Structure 1
Amino acid sequence: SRKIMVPPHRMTPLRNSWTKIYPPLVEHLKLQVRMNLKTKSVELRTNPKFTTDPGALQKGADFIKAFTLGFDLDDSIALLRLDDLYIETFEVKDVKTLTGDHLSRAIGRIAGKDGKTKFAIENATRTRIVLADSKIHILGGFTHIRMARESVVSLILGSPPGKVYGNLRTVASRLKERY
C-alpha cells in the first residue's frame, strides 16, 4: 500500500528499465504496481494471491526507492537479496557546513581525483555510496554503514589525506576479519 515517487534524476533511466526490473520483482514477490507516470509515482501493494510475505511490500518499496535514489539494478538485485543490508540516505547539512565555496571544496574533497576518493572509500569500506552534490545514499551492512558514516564526517570536519587513507586501509581489515 506504499507509494514511491521517482524524481527527475532517474527519469529516462527508469523508463528504459520500465519492464526490465518489473518482470523480476513480479516473478519473485508479485506486488501489484504499475507505471503510473501521470503523477510520476508508482503505488505498490500486496497481491490477493501472492501476499505470503508482509515485508515483500516493504522490500519492493526499498528497491523502488533504490531505483529512484539512483542505485543500479545490481544494487536492486542486492536489494532483493537484502537479508543483511541497509540503506541510509544521509544528505548534506547533517554535518552542516558552508553551502557556498566550502561546499564546492568539500565536493572536490569527496571526489578526490575525479571520483577516485569516492571509489576508494566505496571499495575498501565495502559499501555503495551514491554521493550526489548534497545527498549521500550509502548502502551496506550495519558496520559498513557506520564505517561509511564515520568516514564521511571525517572528511567534512577536516583531516589530512594520509590520515584518512591510512584509516580506510585499517577499517577494511577490521570488518573483513571477524574472529
Structure 2
Amino acid sequence: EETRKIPVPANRYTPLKENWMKIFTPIVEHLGLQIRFNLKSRNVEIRTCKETKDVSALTKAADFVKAFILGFQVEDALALIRLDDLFLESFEITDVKPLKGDHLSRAIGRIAGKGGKTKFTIENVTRTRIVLADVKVHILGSFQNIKMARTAICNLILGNPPSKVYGNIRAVASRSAD
C-alpha cells in the first residue's frame, strides 16, 4: 500500500480542524481511503486500503486536501474531487512585476478590490476560484479558464485599471464561447 501526506500550516490548522468531519466524510465515503492527522508531523495522511475502489482516487483525495489546506472553499474542494479536469494554478505576486513593500500590497488591492468585488467579478466571469494569499494567487478551474484568469490577474497586477481589466476579461470570456 501507499500513502500521501499533505503538510498543514498553523495558519489553517483550526480551519481544518473545524471542517475535519466535512473533509473526512467524502474522503472515506466516496473514495474509501483511511485518513489520519499526524499532530506530531502536523500532516494529513491519506492511505489506501483493501476498501479502495480504484486507482487515482488517492490522487484526487490529495488534490482535495491540498485545495482545503491552501485556503479554497470546502465546496470548491469537493467539486474538484468530483470533477475530472481540475487544476490548481498558483503564481507569486512578484513574478508579474518587480514590486517591493507598500506598492506590492497596493497591487494586491488591484487584484482584490473593495470587499473582494473585483475578485468576485473575475471569479464569476472566468468560472474560476481565486485565493489571494500574502504573496501568492492560487487559481482553480479549467485550463482555458485558468489561462484567462492568469491573463486578467497579471493585467490587473501590472498597473492597468480595474474597469478596463474587467472589460477585457469580459471580451475574452465572450470570445472564448463561454
For residue 77 of structure 2, what is the aligned residue in structure 1?
Answer: 76
| Separation of aligned partners in 1, 2:94 and 2:88 | 18
Q: Give the direction of change, closer, same or farther, for the CA distance of 1:161–1:42 in structure 2 (3 Å limit).
A: closer
Let me know the Cα RMSD of the aligned residues: 1.6
| Separation of aligned partners in 2, 1:112 and 1:49 | 47
Q: Is the 8 A contact 2:129 2:140 kept in 1?
A: yes
After TM superposition, the runs of 4+ consecutive aligned structure 1 residues lying more than 6 A away are none
Deviations 1:29-65 (A, max 9, x none): 1112212222110221221231x32211111000000
Q: Secondary structure at the match of 2:44?
A: strand
For residue 166 of structure 2, what is the aligned residue in structure 1?
Answer: 165
Q: Give the direction of change, closer, same or farther, for the CA distance of 1:126–1:55 in structure 2 (3 Å limit).
A: same
| Separation of aligned partners in 2, 1:31 and 1:147 | 35
| Separation of aligned partners in 2, 1:75 and 1:58 | 16
For residue 25 of structure 2, what is the aligned residue in structure 1?
Answer: 23
Q: Is the 8 A contact 1:87 1:140 kept in 2?
A: yes
For residue 63 of structure 1, what is the aligned residue in structure 2?
Answer: 64
The 5 A counterparts of 1:50-129 are 50=52, 52-129=53-130
Q: Secondary structure at the match of 1:33?
A: strand
Aligned-pair identity in percent equals: 64
| Separation of aligned partners in 1, 2:54 and 2:30 | 11
Please, which runs of 5 or more residues in structure 1 have no aligned partner? none
Question: What is the TM-score when the length of structure 1 is the normalising length?
Answer: 0.90
Question: What is the TM-score when the length of structure 2 is the normalising length?
Answer: 0.90
Corresponding pairs, count: 176
**Aligned partner of 2:69: which letter?**
T
